[PDB]
Ligand binder design. Structure first.
Ligand code: ZN
Ligand code: ZN
Ligand code: ZN
Ligand code: ZN
Lengths: 63, 64
């Protein structure tokens, strides 16, 4: 796996898994999935990865 | 103008726990939202090390 591809993969890991445009911003409580931006998280009542009901949408901060 | 090797090393460093700098970040603090500790180090803090907000709950994260 090339260095350019490893870098591209870590950069993609930071992206919202729905829009792949905005960065991840929300952790779902209680399942813990960290897979959406704030906009893409609005419409979901169940986690689109594991289908656990979302009790709370916690905004994340890296700094 | 940063080399590919250095850009990769920097993104990898960004995933490290800010207390141990060994294990990866795995916990988000509720309510402040800071994502700065691994599971083990989160057990040592009662306040967020970034903003000093009292931590009400330590939520495990999953990227996949
Ligand atoms: Zn999105
Ligand atoms: Zn989930
Ligand atoms: Zn740690
Ligand atoms: Zn904080």
């Amino acid at each position: 796996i090339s260095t350019e591809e490893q870098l591209r993969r870590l950069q993609e890991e930071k992206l919202c898994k729905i829009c792949m445009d905005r960065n991840i911003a929300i952790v779902f409580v209680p399942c813990g999935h960290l897979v959406t931006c704030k906009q893409c998280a609005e419409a979901v009542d169940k986690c689109p990865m594991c289908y656990t009901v979302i009790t709370f949408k916690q905004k994340i901060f890296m700094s």
